[PDB]
Design a protein around this ligand. Structure first.
Ligand SMILES: Nc1nc2c(ncn2[C@@H]2O[C@H](COP(=O)(O)OP(=O)(O)NP(=O)(O)O)[C@@H](O)[C@H]2O)c(=O)[nH]1
Ligand SMILES: [Mg+2]
Length: 159
């Protein structure tokens, strides 16, 4: 079956693992557990198409960026530093893949938190400048999780 090689990147602690575990294991990991490198393979049905999601959950590079087909670039809405770091991930991915239009979704996670420091407007404008979608998520409530991953799969389909 069709396989989608997804890679989740972003600053340490923004919720890359929490988002992935929510999608695949249907629960919120509310504990400290830094990632080195974890892989998740799951058969799913997206828009009627049977496919395999091969998700690489990374640590907060060139090798995995090269094989990845789509990227979720994640930052946390209560961590301005993580938002400012997005540019560096974006540039490295573009360089390694020799492409300025790589399937990608900008993800603003932890949207359940009231202590926001990154305005949705600034993230939206950045995404617009990259020509990619901006989606806010909460690995805690599961809001926007399937949306983020499925949108990424669709971006790959339309590449
Ligand atoms: N309130 C809230 N907390 C979240 C959310 N996503 C993750 N967290 C919390 O943020 C912390 C770090 O999440 P984690 O998934 O481990 O982040 P990571 O990006 O995978 N870290 P690392 O790069 O080191 O692998 C955890 O305490 C986790 O519960 C979210 O949407 N909302
Ligand atoms: Mg992690």
């Amino acid at each position: 079956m069709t396989e989608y090689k997804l890679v989740v990147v972003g600053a340490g602690g923004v919720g890359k693992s929490a988002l992935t575990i929510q999608l695949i294991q249907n629960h919120f990991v509310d504990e400290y557990d830094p990632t080195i490198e974890d892989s998740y393979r799951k058969q799913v049905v997206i828009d009627g198409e049977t496919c395999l999601l091969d998700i690489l959950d990374t640590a907060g590079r060139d090798q995995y960026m090269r094989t990845g087909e789509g990227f979720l670039c994640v930052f946390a809405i209560n961590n301005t530093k993580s938002f400012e770091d997005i540019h560096q991930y974006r540039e490295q991915i573009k360089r390694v893949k020799d492409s300025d239009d790589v399937p990608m979704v900008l993800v603003g996670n932890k949207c359940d938190l009231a202590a926001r420091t990154v305005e949705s407007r600034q993230a939206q404008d950045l995404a617009r400048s990259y020509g990619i979608p901006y989606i806010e998520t909460s690995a805690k409530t599961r809001q926007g999780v399937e949306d983020a991953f499925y949108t990424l799969v669709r971006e790959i389909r339309q590449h």
